[PDB]
Amino acid sequence: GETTDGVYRVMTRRLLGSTQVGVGVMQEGVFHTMWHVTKGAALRSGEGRLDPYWGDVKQDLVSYCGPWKLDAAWDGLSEVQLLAVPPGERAKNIQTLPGIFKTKDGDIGAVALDYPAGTSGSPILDKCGRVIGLYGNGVVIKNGSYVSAITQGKRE
Amino acid sequence: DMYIERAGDITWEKDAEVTGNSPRLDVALDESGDFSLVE
Numbered sequence: 001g002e003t004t005d006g007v008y009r010v011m012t013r014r015l016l017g018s019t020q021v022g023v024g025v026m027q028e029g030v031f032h033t034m035w036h037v038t039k040g041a042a043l044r045s046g047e048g049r050l051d052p053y054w055g056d057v058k059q060d061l062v063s064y065c066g067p068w069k070l071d072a073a074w075d076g077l078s079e080v081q082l083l084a085v086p087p088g089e090r091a092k093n094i095q096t097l098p099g100i101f102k103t104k105d106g107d108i109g110a111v112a113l114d115y116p117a118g119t120s121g122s123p124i125l126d127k128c129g130r131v132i133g134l135y136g137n138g139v140v141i142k143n144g145s146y147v148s149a150i151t152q153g154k155r156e
Numbered sequence: 157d158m159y160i161e162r163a164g165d166i167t168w169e170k171d172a173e174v175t176g177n178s179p180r181l182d183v184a185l186d187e188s189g190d191f192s193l194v195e
């Protein structure tokens with residue numbers, strides 16, 4: 001069905017009413033989201049069906065209809081925009097300067113913005129509008145707030 | 157059974173709300189894709 005570029009909500013009718021379990025990015029006919037949102041299951045776009053193409057639990061990413069298309073990266077200096085799409089709420093751009101996740105295999109940009117778990121898969125953008133990663137996989141710091149990594153895939 | 161609904165365009169908004177801090181955190185990533193704080 002709908003294959004227009006943009007941000008989309010991922011909904012389920014399995015629970016009470018219609019519940020938003022996450023968000024995704026449609027680009028070049030490929031739907032990109034976080035693995036824990038769909039668990040690799042098929043998606044519906046009206047009367048059309050989207051089937052998983054690539055996925056990885058450790059990276060926490062999955063693509064539908066084709067290979068991962070998002071290859072822009074955080075420059076390590078500039079502010080970014082989380083295009084947050086919360087459950088029952090309108091999409092809203094929030095500007096922030098990312099922090100760092102220091103890991104044994106290198107550093108990852110991280111955004112300290114607290115949103116419901118149903119906001120997972122919302123895109124993080126650079127000043128050119130390019131998706132530099134997805135929001136929804138990070139850690140809970142000492143005061144209870146969430147800090148998400150800027151999770152980016154690999155464009156083969 | 158999951159379905160998708162359009163939420164909008166992916167554009168940078170000039171004059172957007174600026175919030176949030178920039179923390180430098182030591183983290184670890186396990187085989188299940190779960191992050192945790194290293195101390």
Ligand SMILES: Cn1cc2c(C(=O)Nc3ccc4c(c3)CNC4)cccc2n1
Pocket residue numbers: 036060115116117118119120135136137138140146188189190
């Ligand atoms: C307090 N809080 C938790 C939040 C999450 C979240 O639980 N993510 C998540 C869930 C399951 C798995 C992964 C990540 C990766 N491996 C499986 C997402 C966005 C906001 C959140 N706030």
